[PDB]
Design an enzyme around this catalytic site. Structure first.
Site, PDB file in Angstrom:
ATOM      1  N   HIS A   1       8.225 -13.517  12.996  1.00  0.00           N
ATOM      2  CA  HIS A   1       8.694 -12.364  12.243  1.00  0.00           C
ATOM      3  C   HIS A   1       9.800 -12.798  11.292  1.00  0.00           C
ATOM      4  O   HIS A   1      10.619 -13.663  11.617  1.00  0.00           O
ATOM      5  CB  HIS A   1       9.306 -11.293  13.153  1.00  0.00           C
ATOM      6  CG  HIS A   1       8.441 -10.869  14.299  1.00  0.00           C
ATOM      7  ND1 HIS A   1       7.092 -10.618  14.172  1.00  0.00           N
ATOM      8  CD2 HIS A   1       8.750 -10.617  15.594  1.00  0.00           C
ATOM      9  CE1 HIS A   1       6.604 -10.246  15.344  1.00  0.00           C
ATOM     10  NE2 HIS A   1       7.590 -10.237  16.223  1.00  0.00           N
TER      11      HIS A   1
ATOM     12  N   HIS B   1      -2.304  -8.553   2.083  1.00  0.00           N
ATOM     13  CA  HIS B   1      -1.698  -7.367   2.684  1.00  0.00           C
ATOM     14  C   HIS B   1      -2.459  -6.865   3.907  1.00  0.00           C
ATOM     15  O   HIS B   1      -1.866  -6.734   4.983  1.00  0.00           O
ATOM     16  CB  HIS B   1      -1.560  -6.268   1.615  1.00  0.00           C
ATOM     17  CG  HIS B   1      -0.887  -5.012   2.089  1.00  0.00           C
ATOM     18  ND1 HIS B   1      -0.043  -4.960   3.179  1.00  0.00           N
ATOM     19  CD2 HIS B   1      -0.926  -3.754   1.587  1.00  0.00           C
ATOM     20  CE1 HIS B   1       0.393  -3.722   3.338  1.00  0.00           C
ATOM     21  NE2 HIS B   1      -0.123  -2.972   2.379  1.00  0.00           N
TER      22      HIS B   1
ATOM     23  N   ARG C   1       4.184  -2.964  19.458  1.00  0.00           N
ATOM     24  CA  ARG C   1       2.777  -2.646  19.231  1.00  0.00           C
ATOM     25  C   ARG C   1       1.856  -3.731  19.777  1.00  0.00           C
ATOM     26  O   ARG C   1       0.732  -3.432  20.200  1.00  0.00           O
ATOM     27  CB  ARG C   1       2.529  -2.411  17.746  1.00  0.00           C
ATOM     28  CG  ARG C   1       3.308  -1.223  17.172  1.00  0.00           C
ATOM     29  CD  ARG C   1       3.167  -1.138  15.665  1.00  0.00           C
ATOM     30  NE  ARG C   1       3.601  -2.368  15.014  1.00  0.00           N
ATOM     31  CZ  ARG C   1       3.352  -2.670  13.741  1.00  0.00           C
ATOM     32  NH1 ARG C   1       2.672  -1.818  12.970  1.00  0.00           N
ATOM     33  NH2 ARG C   1       3.770  -3.817  13.233  1.00  0.00           N
TER      34      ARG C   1
ATOM     35  N   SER D   1       0.819  -1.215   0.000  1.00  0.00           N
ATOM     36  CA  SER D   1       0.000   0.000   0.000  1.00  0.00           C
ATOM     37  C   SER D   1       0.854   1.266   0.000  1.00  0.00           C
ATOM     38  O   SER D   1       0.565   2.208  -0.750  1.00  0.00           O
ATOM     39  CB  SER D   1      -1.001  -0.004   1.154  1.00  0.00           C
ATOM     40  OG  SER D   1      -0.346  -0.129   2.396  1.00  0.00           O
TER      41      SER D   1
ATOM     42  N   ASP E   1      -0.900  -7.514  14.684  1.00  0.00           N
ATOM     43  CA  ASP E   1      -2.155  -8.100  14.228  1.00  0.00           C
ATOM     44  C   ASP E   1      -2.634  -9.228  15.129  1.00  0.00           C
ATOM     45  O   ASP E   1      -3.813  -9.596  15.072  1.00  0.00           O
ATOM     46  CB  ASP E   1      -1.986  -8.606  12.794  1.00  0.00           C
ATOM     47  CG  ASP E   1      -1.471  -7.523  11.854  1.00  0.00           C
ATOM     48  OD1 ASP E   1      -2.119  -6.459  11.753  1.00  0.00           O
ATOM     49  OD2 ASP E   1      -0.413  -7.733  11.220  1.00  0.00           O
TER      50      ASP E   1
HETATM   51 CL   LIG Z   1       2.933  -6.093   1.583  1.00  0.00          CL
HETATM   52 CL   LIG Z   2       2.689  -3.002   6.608  1.00  0.00          CL
END
Ligand SMILES: [Cl-]
Ligand SMILES: [Cl-]
Ligand SMILES: CC(C)(COP(=O)(O)OP(=O)(O)OC[C@H]1O[C@@H](n2cnc3c(N)ncnc32)[C@H](O)[C@@H]1OP(=O)(O)O)[C@@H](O)C(=O)NCCC(=O)NCCS
Ligand SMILES: O=C([O-])CC(=O)C(=O)O
Ligand SMILES: [Cl-]
Ligand SMILES: [K+]
Ligand SMILES: [K+]
Ligand SMILES: [K+]
Lengths: 438, 432
Positions: free
Chosen positions: A317, A271, A326, A241, A372
């Site tokens: 990760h 994404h 976060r 994005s 997330d």
């Molecule tokens: Cl991406």
């Molecule tokens: Cl991102």
């Protein structure tokens, strides 16, 4: 005190000169190779973007102009009567590299809210779109429909010089930011509720306006949205994005068309849906385990997931070597506001045992959770249970980082992004000549 | 004969195996360096895309599956009674690498037209958009609003196998292509005319249906549109619109969202909107000899503005798409005043740009010569010209998107750094 535009106008020429001198002195230095496997692998690992606002620190997590999550929690001003920094404050930092005063943030919030009235044609467009048109498609449609307001497009048609582009880009960006909470809330009310929406509070901040218009007066929900919108606002320039927005902007399309394109990238299921993927997995786990979140029950569920060839969503990760700060900020929010919430107890039980299980399984280099893994549970607590809306919230946040870089790119006169391509037939010829040497 | 989908289903597994072996055996071969000046210069010269349908040579210009424009005019089948190539015939070649027979092209045109009916919510939204909302914004809005019809989006949510993505991508692409002439003509009729729309002829070709729905049955205008939609259809993988569509598509957004994003890049005045910029610049010059033209060029440059329709990221000589358009004008209207003005500027602009000393290419691109041809036939509304570009470029965009999904191409995701971090990276490199 100086406004954001005034301070930026003093800082950007220094950055522009610094960049010009850096490229002049070092432009011929080789910073990477391009291997054939990289062009066929999405350019993974290639330095391909100059993105000033944020850089991922492999030890300390995402840094915004050098500041960790802990640093921005300590350093940014807070909303009156709150311990949460505002996303408007982080936007100031992303664009200028400096922390604003509380008074500067309050004035910026008021400027954004003064720009928040949707033109009639956008209200009409949104109110008449079908409820089965996905919220992200409605979002990018509404942003594109604002192109009729674009000050950059109108000024470009009047023949402004390249040295003046940034000023109109800045104004379009603030005009657009001011309208994002209204667009997002209108979509929420139309698709999921009764279509009824209140009015913007000219003294409320960006997140508070979003939550109130969505339909809640709960001050804790307001605080959650301040946190959510701050921590999702920027994460480097290589992701789909951010890159899409930069690419479209580099052809001098306005911030409206650039952000709309970036939102379409965020709408892609690979994404912008990690939050929803985690939530779906949590719900399926909860059903399968019959609400039993004990260590032995959870560890067995995690072992069965990994042994069957599937991953634990939100864990692992590629680069970051510890838990995403976060994630920890969201865990702290839940601990401080609703530690007995059943869905948080499941998320917390997974946190206690997943890194150990992933380590022993031996197929995950950095077995720690990301942002997330924790965002959906907090949204669920306050009643925002419509998961197909979650990427809209993500876009309302990420627009800050996208537009900060777009302003900077126009201020430094960044060139059109235009690499070279070849067909497979031509890559074979190129490779043959490289390996033969002649 | 085989349909496009049938033939593609036979060739894509062979391409998939060919790519896999190629990368397995040669993946570690270095094909380029990345210099600091390239990351700070729009990645110019970096091989960064795999794009099958077309490859751009800096000296010779575009080749479509190895064929020049002149080759395409000879090798592809044409409409009956016409000497111009059909864009849907080129689309067949872009997707398959093979030349379709005349009957295959006619069948493809009919399939496209069978998919052309707009849903009511799209007609209604277009009818209600303000006339002053730029046509490119209306166009990408309408394309995005078709996402509710997306077969790929619905299949993905239902959990289809990655091996089946291409089939739904293909159907969405043809559904979308079939509707583009209708969307474009609807925008034209609403903004500039009475909003009334004729009916699609099930047996007419793509460009002919576009011109007919705009309102014209002028046969030479139809032939111009066939040429226009053919030559604008693809320009390799690194141009902004193609690259944007690839990037968005690589995250598995549908053809609707991928094309809408590509259109927004095409709408930039340094990209496809240069064709509107050229027309407006020509008209401003006309309103205001070699000396007068040269003075107008210098006044533009001294105002901190570009000369529209000149320069290129890759081309270093005159664009063959410019020459193909000059040829059309020479064969149809060599005395047209606006054509003579474009030709007179060609004699002066390269020298001025060379003395100016900034551009790496002082020669014209496709946008310098396209608008003048449309003006001849009475399509005078230059704010519509990039919509026509978008109707064409969708062919090349969607051919690669189908190919990408058939082979399982990766998400495009390079790495970024800040200037502060690039300085640290460079310092460490230069210390070693
Ligand atoms: Cl991406
Ligand atoms: Cl991102
Ligand atoms: C097409 C274009 C965007 C390519 O950009 P590019 O690859 O970076 O081109 P260059 O390498 O030659 O740019 C070097 C300099 O020459 C300038 N330049 C390039 N083409 C120019 C033109 N037609 N008029 C004026 N200046 C021009 C650039 O702005 C740049 O200036 P800068 O150093 O101060 O930043 C550029 O040629 C352009 O702006 N053309 C006019 C718009 C147009 O016709 N677009 C359609 C392209 S098919
Ligand atoms: O190739 C480019 O960069 C721009 C161009 O001419 C096109 O996309 O047609
Ligand atoms: Cl090598
Ligand atoms: K203009
Ligand atoms: K990317
Ligand atoms: K590009």
């Amino acid at each position: 005190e100086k406004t954001l535009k005034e301070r930026f106008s003093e800082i950007y020429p220094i950055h522009a000169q610094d960049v010009r001198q850096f490229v002049k002195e070092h432009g011929k230095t080789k910073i990477s190779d391009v291997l054939l496997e990289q062009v066929y692998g999405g350019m993974r690992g290639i330095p391909g973007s100059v993105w000033e606002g944020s850089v991922l620190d492999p030890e300390d997590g995402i840094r915004f102009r050098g500041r960790t999550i802990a640093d921005i929690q300590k350093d940014l001003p807070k909303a009156k009567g709150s311990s949460q920094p505002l996303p408007e404050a982080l936007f100031w930092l992303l664009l200028t590299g400096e922390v604003p005063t509380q008074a500067q943030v309050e004035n910026l919030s008021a400027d954004l809210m003064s720009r928040s009235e949707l033109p009639s044609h956008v209200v009409q467009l949104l109110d008449n779109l079908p409820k089965d048109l996905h919220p992200m498609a409605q979002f990018s449609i509404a942003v594109t429909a604002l192109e009729s307001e674009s000050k950059f497009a109108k000024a470009y048609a009047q023949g402004i010089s390249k040295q003046d582009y940034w000023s109109y880009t800045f104004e379009d960006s603030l005009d657009l930011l001011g309208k994002l909470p209204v667009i997002a809330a209108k979509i929420y009310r139309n698709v999921f509720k009764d279509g009824k929406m209140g009015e913007v509070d000219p003294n409320a901040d960006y997140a508070k306006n979003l939550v109130n218009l969505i339909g809640s007066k709960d001050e804790d929900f307001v605080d959650l949205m301040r946190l959510y919108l701050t921590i999702h606002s920027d994460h480097e320039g290589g992701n789909v994005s951010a890159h899409t927005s930069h690419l479209v902007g580099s052809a001098l399309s306005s911030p409206y068309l650039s952000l709309a394109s970036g939102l379409n990238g965020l709408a892609g299921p690979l994404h912008g849906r990690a939050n929803q993927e985690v939530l779906e997995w949590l719900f399926a786990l909860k059903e399968e385990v019959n609400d039993d979140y004990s260590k032995d029950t959870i560890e067995k569920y995690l072992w069965d997931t990994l042994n069957s060839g599937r991953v634990i969503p939100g864990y692992g990760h590629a680069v970051l070597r510890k838990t995403d700060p976060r994630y920890m900020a969201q865990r702290k929010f839940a601990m401080d506001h609703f530690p007995d919430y059943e869905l948080f107890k499941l998320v917390s039980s997974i946190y206690e045992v997943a890194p150990g299980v992933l380590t022993e399984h031996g197929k995950t280099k950095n077995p720690w959770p990301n942002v997330d893994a924790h965002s959906g549970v907090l949204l669920q607590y306050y009643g925002l249970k419509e998961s197909s809306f979650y990427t809209v919230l993500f876009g309302v946040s990420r627009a800050f980082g996208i537009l900060a870089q777009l302003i900077t790119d126009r201020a430094i006169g960044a060139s059109i992004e235009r690499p070279k391509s070849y067909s497979t037939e031509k890559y074979k010829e190129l490779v043959k000549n490289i390996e033969s040497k002649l």
